[PDB]
Curated annotation (Swiss-Prot):
CC terms in the record's Gene Ontology section: chromatin; cytosol; fibrillar center; nucleoplasm; nucleus; pericentric heterochromatin
Outcome of substituting G168A: Abolishes histone demethylase activity
Binding site for 2-oxoglutarate: Y130, N196, K204, K239
Post-translational modification: Ubiquitinated by RNF8 and RNF168 following DNA damage, leading to its degradation. Degradation promotes accessibility of H4K20me2 mark for DNA repair protein TP53BP1, which is then recruited. Also ubiquitinated by the SCF(FBXO22) complex; leading to proteasomal degradation.
Entry protein name: Lysine-specific demethylase 4A
Summary of the function given for this chain in its UniProt record: Histone demethylase that specifically demethylates 'Lys-9' and 'Lys-36' residues of histone H3, thereby playing a central role in histone code. Does not demethylate histone H3 'Lys-4', H3 'Lys-27' nor H4 'Lys-20'. Demethylates trimethylated H3 'Lys-9' and H3 'Lys-36' residue, while it has no activity on mono- and dimethylated residues. Demethylation of Lys residue generates formaldehyde and succinate. Participates in transcriptional repression of ASCL2 and E2F-responsive promoters via the recruitment of histone deacetylases and NCOR1, respectively.
Every JmjC domain range: 140-306
Full protein stretch here: 3 to 353 of 1064
Subcellular compartments: Nucleus
Broad class of where this protein is predominantly found: nucleus
Keyword line: Acetylation, Chromatin regulator, Dioxygenase, Host-virus interaction, Iron, Isopeptide bond, Metal-binding, Nucleus, Oxidoreductase, Phosphoprotein, Repeat, Transcription, Transcription regulation, Ubl conjugation, Zinc, Zinc-finger
MF-aspect GO terms: histone demethylase activity; histone H3K36 demethylase activity; histone H3K36me2/H3K36me3 demethylase activity; histone H3K9 demethylase activity; histone H3K9me2/H3K9me3 demethylase activity; histone H4K20me2 reader activity; ubiquitin protein ligase binding; zinc ion binding
Organism the protein comes from: Homo sapiens (Human)
Tissue: Ubiquitous.
Sites where the protein binds Fe cation: H186, E188, H274
Length: 351
């Protein structure tokens, strides 16, 4: 009730940290959770105006996009399935050229609602190319604040313990977008946190569903896609499923929306379903991370059961280290802990 009194509407919150607050990443995450930001599943953090992760983005024209994907979308009435078609490798220069070309460039519009309507109206036409899942970073090696390449959260325990790297999850990914490129409805692998930084370019728009309401979205999605639901216990993790905000409203699924500008951070929280699209040519960097609060989510995450090489992180080291008194019960399959999506991560006891 202390936590349930904070952000009771579960709306997307925006934060403007000072440079002092901005330096300690995990601490500021704990803070915004103390303010109830996590209840939305998504939050925006606008960094100090003097902070910059890179002096200049003029040298990256020759950066290679090894596996650009053409996004074919099929559907109607607010329900869509996205099929990825991998294209030949190409450079950022070659990508931007195509992105800004007359055929793929952003349509003209007044307010955001107009561009949003055009997105949902034309989603299945003129399939765009997304320069997605590029291994790398655009942070300068010296930037110590909010460095996606080295956030130093307890997610580091995975590699530290096993040597295992999972691309885009405990390593950084770059996303080069063009108009009408999409990311489908999903939570993160193992229901982790994620961080997303829009380095440059046109905006990225987001939809989010509160974790305390995530199950309702799942039930809706299973109803809409019964074939997919029968074939996999977590088919949304395929990240192929697009659902319009009008469809969510029609079925009483609560949600919020936010538009991300260049130079801005987006944080997604455990079991926070989100989706969205890019307004035009841009570039974003992202990875996943953890807090102590995530551990229970990780233990209870419902994973994909049909796809091989799907991301499954062993929770053992986390339970042993941060829940020693529950380790035996958990191994015996008798840990029946129930998650309260309103509670902030325990690191926020300072606040
Ligand atoms: N395929 C995938 C996996 C995990 C993710 O977290 C995302 C994702 C991508 C974007 C993006 O395309 O910028 C935004 C939010 N989530 C995509
Ligand atoms: Cl699912
Ligand atoms: Cl990612
Ligand atoms: Mn995501
Ligand atoms: Mn189906
Ligand atoms: Zn599956």
């Amino acid at each position: 009730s202390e936590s349930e009194t904070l952000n009771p509407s579960a709306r997307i919150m925006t934060f403007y940290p000072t440079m002092e607050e901005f330096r300690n990443f995990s601490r500021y995450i704990a803070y915004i959770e103390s303010q109830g930001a996590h209840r939305a599943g998504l939050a925006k953090v606008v960094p100090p105006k003097e902070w910059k992760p890179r002096a200049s983005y003029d040298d990256i024209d020759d950066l290679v996009i090894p596996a650009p994907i053409q996004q074919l979308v099929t559907g109607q009435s607010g329900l869509f399935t996205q099929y990825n078609i991998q294209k030949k490798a190409m450079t950022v220069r070659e990508f931007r050229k195509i992105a800004n070309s007359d055929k793929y460039c952003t349509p003209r519009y007044s307010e955001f609602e107009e561009l949003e309507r055009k997105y949902w109206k034309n989603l299945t036409f003129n399939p765009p190319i997304y320069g997605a899942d590029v291994n790398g970073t655009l942070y300068e090696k010296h930037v110590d604040e909010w460095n996606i390449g080295r956030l130093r959260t307890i997610l580091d325990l995975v590699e530290k313990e096993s040597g295992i790297t999972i691309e885009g999850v405990n390593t950084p990914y770059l996303y080069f977008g063009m108009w009408k490129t999409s990311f489908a409805w999903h939570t993160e692998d193992m229901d982790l946190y994620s961080i997303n930084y829009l380095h440059f370019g046109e905006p990225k728009s987001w939809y989010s569903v509160p974790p305390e309401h995530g199950k309702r979205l799942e039930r809706l999605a299973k109803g809409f896609f019964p074939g997919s639901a029968q074939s996999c216990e977590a088919f949304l993790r395929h990240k192929m499923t697009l659902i319009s905000p009008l469809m969510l409203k029609k079925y009483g699924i609560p949600f919020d929306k936010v538009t991300q500008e260049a130079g801005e951070f987006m944080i997604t929280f455990p079991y926070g379903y989100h989706a969205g699209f890019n307004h035009g040519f841009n570039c974003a960097e992202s990875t996943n991370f953890a807090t102590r609060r995530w551990i229970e989510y990780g233990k209870q995450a419902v994973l994909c059961s049909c796809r091989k090489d799907m991301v499954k992180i062993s929770m053992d080291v986390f339970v042993r280290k941060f829940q020693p008194e529950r380790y035996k019960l958990w191994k015996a399959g008798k840990d029946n802990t129930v998650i309260d999506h309103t509670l902030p991560t325990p690191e926020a006891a300072e606040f």
